[PDB]
Design a protein around this ligand. Sequence first.
Ligand SMILES: *[C@@H]1O[C@H](CO)[C@@H](O)[C@H](O)[C@H]1NC(C)=O
Lengths: 292, 49
Amino acid sequence: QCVNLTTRTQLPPAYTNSFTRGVYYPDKVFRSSVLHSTQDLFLPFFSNVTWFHAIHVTKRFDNPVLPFNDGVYFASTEKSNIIRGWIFGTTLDSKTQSLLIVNNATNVVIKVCEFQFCNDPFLGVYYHKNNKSWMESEFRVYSSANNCTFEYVSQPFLMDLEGKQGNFKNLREFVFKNIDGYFKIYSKHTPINLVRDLPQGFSALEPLVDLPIGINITRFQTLLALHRSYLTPGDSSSGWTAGAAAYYVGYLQPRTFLLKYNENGTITDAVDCALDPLSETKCTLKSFTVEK
Amino acid sequence: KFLPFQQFGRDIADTTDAVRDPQTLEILDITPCSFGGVSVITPGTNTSN
Ligand SMILES: *[C@@H]1O[C@H](CO)[C@@H](O)[C@H](O)[C@H]1NC(C)=O
């Protein structure tokens, strides 16, 4: 049924502050060159988040799960598509449904079914020497799935997959929300190539798809395409082969914020309504500039 | 410039100043008409009407 392949070695988590990222249009309504005050689950300008580095060949194997807790602000800078998708469910079994999203060069598939989850799920990709290409043939992640509910397939939305050698020169920022039985989805793409981790720029996220799914969710996890390694019987290696990747996660919170537009109509600046006394004042009076 | 992921538009006062058709995407602004109040400039009644 399932095979337990766990490593006794463990590593403590690592934290990282959110420089300025996290802002969007709280409602699909449009405005321009005016300042408004709203109230929705946003990302405080100066908030602390956590990083995740799962790269095992020094060597380290750590692919844990992250509880949902009323919305998630996701991101990453993958290049070889190490992260394929994720699943949901409180019990991680066939008793509950799940959402599966796989994107490739052919189409994008978003399957919502009750897939069986193994102890240590992980994707597997082989390499055909005759074809001189890498594909997938091992799909033992889920024992079986039944009670199909939703299934969406379409062309790759925003996946370029053009550059044959991209060394961390892209940034992906989305946001997943669940309220009133609706598991809303967003999509935002700002290309970046800097030696540092986070930039000093500004932008906002946009909705991607509205998939109404009603089910209690408090813990989700992703999957990784462990590539196949050709090893002779006399090698007796660790048996684990994977690439390099590290995704970025955040957190949502309800609070009042003030977003500022421009002549074009795109947000350019904003100030938190409860960050510090100075910002409180900018919300209170009308705007950003305050005289003595 | 309307980003093609918003739905409505409201400048201020809950004024839904963005009306768009499902087939075609167009932005618009709504404001109350010019309108005017009136006042009568009357000399003495006994003088003239
Ligand atoms: C208005 O004109 C009438 C004439 O019929 C006169 O009796 C009256 O005193 C006048 N009133 C004033 C305020 O001039």
